[PDB]
């Protein structure tokens, strides 16, 4: 239906679809085996990540698709985000197809890795020790902000920068994903919970919720959330509090405390985060120098 492009476009009998991924607002992720995806290894098997319509789609689902797709053509490759592998158009459903994550999302990949409780009878040497230790915490801050970083300089507005859209490698390197959204800005149910007990609208800056104002000092704002999601382990913002309350709390200048064992310089950037001004937020360049800064003087 739509028009072949040879640079992206991937023969579709050379992908074995597996286990679905998730569902998003528009369209869904299935797991995938790929032969060849490397033309010089034409038979060579690989692991990739599809995005799909769903089977109920409207052709307003499938624009939003054709846009995403149209999207990662442009962004172009890097380490910390969800690379564009290929795409399928011709002669069957439109397929994006993308790099898969095996660890899942950061929100699950630290909550699923919180260090034993007091409750654990000793066994061994390091029974007190957790997976999770200080420099990989500021190595995943840094990797998502260098991620943000390159995403700004292609004028790519993530809009909904959150730790469950940062995926996370066999190797633990950060991927932002899902950036090329059409996210519906001007019609957000602000009151929305999801399936998993998520509030998307404790990661919106100011002037993104009360003024329907993105830039990407709004995805700094959002950073920030997440650097205090990252430092909790996988934590809720915003503990205990409903979105009627956050709506004023937030009139009334409100920010989140300086949660358990997070030093001093962490807990300061998160503030610079969110900062009433955006003009007053450090950029994402400058959160990649402070946060290197803090990753080579713990990385000895
Ligand atoms: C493939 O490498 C792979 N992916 C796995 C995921 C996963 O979530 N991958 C993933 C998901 C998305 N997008 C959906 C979420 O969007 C924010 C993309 C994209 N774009 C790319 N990749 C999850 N698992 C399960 C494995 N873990 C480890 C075992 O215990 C917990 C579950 C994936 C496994 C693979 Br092989």
Redesign the pocket.
């Known amino acids: 239906d739509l028009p072949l492009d040879p640079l992206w476009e991937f023969p579709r009998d050379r992908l074995v679809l597996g286990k679905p991924?998730?569902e998003?607002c528009f369209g869904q992720?299935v797991?995938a085996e790929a032969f060849g995806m490397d033309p010089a290894r034409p038979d060579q098997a690989s692991?990739?990540?599809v995005?799909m319509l769903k089977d109920n789609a409207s052709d307003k689902d499938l624009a939003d698709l054709v846009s995403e797709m149209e999207v990662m053509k442009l962004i172009g490759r890097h380490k910390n985000i969800?690379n564009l592998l290929g795409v399928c158009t011709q002669e069957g459903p439109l397929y994006v197809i993308?790099?898969?994550?095996?660890?899942?999302?950061l929100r699950?990949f630290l909550r699923?890795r919180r260090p034993p409780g007091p409750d654990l009878s000793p066994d061994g040497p390091r029974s007190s020790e957790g997976p999770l230790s200080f420099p990989v915490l500021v190595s995943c801050a840094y990797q998502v902000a260098r991620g943000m970083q390159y995403l700004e300089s292609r004028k790519c507005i993530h809009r909904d920068l959150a730790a469950?859209?940062?995926?996370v490698?066999?190797d633990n390197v950060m991927?932002i994903?899902?950036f090329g959204l059409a996210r519906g800005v001007h019609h957000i149910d602000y009151y929305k919970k999801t399936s998993n007990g998520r509030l998307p609208v404790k990661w919106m800056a100011p002037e993104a919720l009360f003024d329907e104002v993105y830039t990407h000092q709004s995805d700094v704002w959002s950073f920030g959330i997440l650097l205090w999601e990252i430092f909790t382990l996988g934590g809720s913002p915003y503990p205990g509090i409903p979105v009627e309350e956050l709506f004023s709390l937030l009139r009334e200048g409100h920010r989140m405390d300086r949660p358990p064992h997070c030093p001093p310089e962490l807990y300061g950037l998160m503030r610079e985060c969110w900062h009433a001004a955006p003009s007053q937020r450090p950029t994402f360049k400058q959160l990649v120098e402070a946060l290197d800064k803090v990753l080579l003087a713990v990385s000895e």
Do not use: M, P
Request: overall charge positive; aromatic content about 0%; hydrophobic content about 40%.
């Open positions: 991924l998730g998003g992720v797991r692991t990739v990540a995005k969800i993308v790099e898969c994550a095996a660890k899942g999302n699950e699923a469950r859209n940062v995926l490698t066999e991927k994903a899902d």
